[PDB]
Amino acid sequence: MNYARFITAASAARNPSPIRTMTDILSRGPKSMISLAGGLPNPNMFPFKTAVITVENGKTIQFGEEMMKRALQYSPSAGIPELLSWLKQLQIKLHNPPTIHYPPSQGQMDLCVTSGSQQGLCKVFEMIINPGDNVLLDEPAYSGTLQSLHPLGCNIINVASDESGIVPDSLRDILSRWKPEDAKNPQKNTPKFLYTVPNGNNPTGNSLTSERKKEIYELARKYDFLIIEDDPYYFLQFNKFRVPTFLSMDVDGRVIRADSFSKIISSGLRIGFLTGPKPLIERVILHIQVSTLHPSTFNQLMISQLLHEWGEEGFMAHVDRVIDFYSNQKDAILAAADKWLTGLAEWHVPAAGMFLWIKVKGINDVKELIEEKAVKMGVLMLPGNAFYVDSSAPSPYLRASFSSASPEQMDVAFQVLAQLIKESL
Amino acid sequence: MNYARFITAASAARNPSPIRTMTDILSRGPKSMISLAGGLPNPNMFPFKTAVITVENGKTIQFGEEMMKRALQYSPSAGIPELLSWLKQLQIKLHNPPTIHYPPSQGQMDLCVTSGSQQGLCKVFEMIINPGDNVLLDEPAYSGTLQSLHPLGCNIINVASDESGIVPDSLRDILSRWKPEDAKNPQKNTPKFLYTVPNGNNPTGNSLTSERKKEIYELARKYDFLIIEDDPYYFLQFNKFRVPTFLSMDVDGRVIRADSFSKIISSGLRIGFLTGPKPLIERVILHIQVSTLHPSTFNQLMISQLLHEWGEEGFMAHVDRVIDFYSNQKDAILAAADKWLTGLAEWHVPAAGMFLWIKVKGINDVKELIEEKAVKMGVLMLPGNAFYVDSSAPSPYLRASFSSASPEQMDVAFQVLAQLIKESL
Ligand SMILES: O=C(O)[C@@H](Cc1ccccc1)N1C(=O)c2cc(Cl)c(Cl)cc2C1=O
């Protein structure tokens, strides 16, 4: 409702930046208009001329001469228009966000293609956080989020979580420290936002439920904080039905959502996108305009043509192929865990994503059990310390990836792990 | 010599971020080592499988199965190793920087590939600037640089410039506001850095001279400030011998240089690179680690393989073709201007780049002459207002691009402008 509350002075001071009134007054005027006003380098000097890219379960992608010149040239900061248009329709299909037809100033849905979803998240954090601001999230969390938040000088307030994600009663108790009207009085610093990964949290593998999302949203309205929905595993849910998203229930216009193709189409191409209230997305776009300028035009065209040939049906058929693969990998690593972790450890079934989160019994810290004893036995799993704000505290947890390993490799790996737990007790 | 002086609290607080101890303890240990510690998604689900990219004056570039899988997956934040090593050798060949073998803490030359050179520049500004800080640069300046600096709250101090770039006497006079020893006393805020585009300034087309660079460098030592050498037109100089760069005379380790392939190889692939003192480059790398993560692996491999097949010889042959083209366009737009600007305007001959800077005589502000009268006559050139800190002040200057226009188009465009000037005198 009042987005200025969530925008630092620096972010608010931004104004629009280059490649401006050159390819828009010429993108509608007569074909006889000469423009020596543009800052674009002549693409005929560029040495790549054509491209052919083969696709599994899809038409081969071809960049002819003119399409290649476009791919090698600057493009809009928010993304190329045909990709933004497809993605917007996808978001309407998947989430029917309440904000689609709101006035801009009151949170009309808006999209920005980013150079990876993490770029969008970083610029969102920078847009909002003043030193000393309070922010809410569940630990353990993606180490990259914690390392992004650390230098911004916010107080991270841990919200309790279990196998169903954030626990609303913990969030409610935390918020009781304030009165709601304090959100209109910045003197005692009500939380600016809540961040969470609602599906297949890295490292736990846990997902939020529909009912807790609703509860959490009512509290976000009551104390007027934003929800940053970081959902890179959204297209990797193993349940029959995808849980409704925060975006899908965002009647106020207080959700900023991050999507990624990093886990399902390509991480190396650095393509993700933000969906959120237009006034906040605009502040991110202005920062992009003085930073990366835009995501790679070449990589956007690769993905846009892939998606447009697939149609929504072919895209969703791809995600079902990826769901099939990761859920079978999940079944395999759970079988190896049941097999070898013998009442030596505890774990919850991952609801989505690509990680299994193992609590080792009878040991207070495992990073000495792994980085010393396990490495020379030819096995490595990631100690859980790195996923907490205080990464020096002891952690009995290990994060095990099931994205790649064969059942044979899982059997050997959990064999070795079992031996190292027993001889350490 | 004291780099902490040039690093903000936030920037200094950054710690090294993900994709860490997984592909380095496995990149040297035995191949019998199993790792479930890694976080990488399975590239076999990614739908692009092979690529063939044709090159003009070059061997076609082929991404086979394994190369494509690498192209589609995460890679190091500073860039892929073979691109970094090639570029490092290029910088040694072009600039022979005095810092190559310095100890890290006193400015050992280091490089970062960035997602466009502007990303590296932006993160350099963010690394350095506290609100209230004083910075030096010459106006008119790239509008993207002015829009980047404005929200950081620094006081921009304009240094005088002429057809030979920054005037050293002007820089010396401005600095006489402080005593040299004031640089070791942050209380009265000596300038943190001087920023300049030394070759083919956008919008003026002017370039610095060797003698002036040496003078400027001496002042940067005397008053102990950094030089940010933003040099995107370095490979578009019309002379036979390139002017030595600030980097080439940087015996103190106080130069941060930005290079770009945007103007000669591809703007759309978003590839640039920073060269500078290792302590400062490292701060930028850590910001990339929580932001874009890395430049497109696919696009880095395209460029890297092209560069490795060309060798430095093939690369320099390419730049000389492009110089030749742009120098002929320059000759052409100067002819048009001689022909139809009849003592109606003044201009200097551009020394590099792709722009001509035209001062209309007898008119105080041209943006009404262009955005109103010229548009309906079918001709567009860019008013100079956008290239100054105060973009509301009147400007008699126009920027005209000679990157693309045919001689016929130039002849028409300047005929129209001439008529408008004459009937607008
Ligand atoms: O680069 C990234 O964004 C991802 C890649 C990824 C892909 C699929 C599933 C999960 C992550 N990534 C992590 O989140 C992560 C955490 C830690 Cl603790 C380490 Cl040590 C390394 C990484 C990492 O590469």
UniProtKB/Swiss-Prot annotation, chains A, B:
Q: How does activity depend on temperature?
A: Optimum temperature is 50 degrees Celsius.
Query: Which residue intervals make up region (Disordered)?
Result: 181-208
Notes on activation and inhibition = Kynurenine transaminase activity is competitively inhibited by aminoadipate, asparagine, glutamate, histidine, cysteine, lysine, 3-hydroxy-kynurenine and phenylalanine.
Top enzyme class: transferase
The record ties this protein, via Pfam families, to: Aminotran_1_2
Which residues does substrate bind?
R20, Y74, Y142, N202, R399
Q: What is its EC number?
A: 2.6.1.39, 2.6.1.4, 2.6.1.63, 2.6.1.7
Modification N6-succinyllysine, positions: K263, K339, K367
Keyword set, alphabetical order: Acetylation, Aminotransferase, Mitochondrion, Pyridoxal phosphate, Transferase, Transit peptide
Q: Which residues are recorded as modified (N6-(pyridoxal phosphate)lysine)?
A: K263
Write out the annotated subcellular location: Mitochondrion
Stated pH dependence: Optimum pH is 7-9.
Extract the transit peptide range from the record.
1-29
Q: In which tissues is it expressed?
A: Higher expression in the liver. Also found in heart, brain, kidney, pancreas, prostate, testis and ovary.
| Reaction catalysed by this enzyme | glycine + 2-oxoglutarate = glyoxylate + L-glutamate; L-kynurenine + 2-oxoglutarate = kynurenate + L-glutamate + H2O; L-kynurenine + glyoxylate = kynurenate + glycine + H2O; 3-hydroxy-L-kynurenine + glyoxylate = xanthurenate + glycine + H2O
The cofactors required by this protein are: pyridoxal 5'-phosphate
User: Which BP terms does GO give this entry?
Assistant: 2-oxoglutarate metabolic process; alpha-amino acid metabolic process; biosynthetic process; glutamate metabolic process; kynurenine metabolic process; L-lysine catabolic process to acetyl-CoA via saccharopine
- GO MF entries: 2-aminoadipate transaminase activity; glycine:2-oxoglutarate aminotransferase activity; kynurenine-glyoxylate transaminase activity; kynurenine-oxoglutarate transaminase activity; methionine-glyoxylate transaminase activity; protein homodimerization activity; pyridoxal phosphate binding
Among InterPro entries, the record links this protein to: Aminotransferase_I/II_large, Class-I_PLP-dep_aminotransf, PyrdxlP-dep_Trfase, PyrdxlP-dep_Trfase_major
Give the function comment from the record.
Answer: Transaminase with broad substrate specificity. Has transaminase activity towards aminoadipate, kynurenine, methionine and glutamate. Shows activity also towards tryptophan, aspartate and hydroxykynurenine. Accepts a variety of oxo-acids as amino-group acceptors, with a preference for 2-oxoglutarate, 2-oxocaproic acid, phenylpyruvate and alpha-oxo-gamma-methiol butyric acid. Can also use glyoxylate as amino-group acceptor (in vitro).
Q: Subunit arrangement?
A: Homodimer.
Q: Which family does it belong to?
A: Belongs to the class-I pyridoxal-phosphate-dependent aminotransferase family.
Which PANTHER family is this protein grouped with?
AMINOTRANSFERASE, KYNURENINE_ALPHA-AMINOADIPATE AMINOTRANSFERASE, MITOCHONDRIAL
Name of the protein in its database record: Kynurenine/alpha-aminoadipate aminotransferase, mitochondrial
Q: Which organism is it from?
A: Homo sapiens
Which lineage ranks, top first, belong to the organism behind this chain?
Eukaryota, Metazoa, Chordata, Craniata, Vertebrata
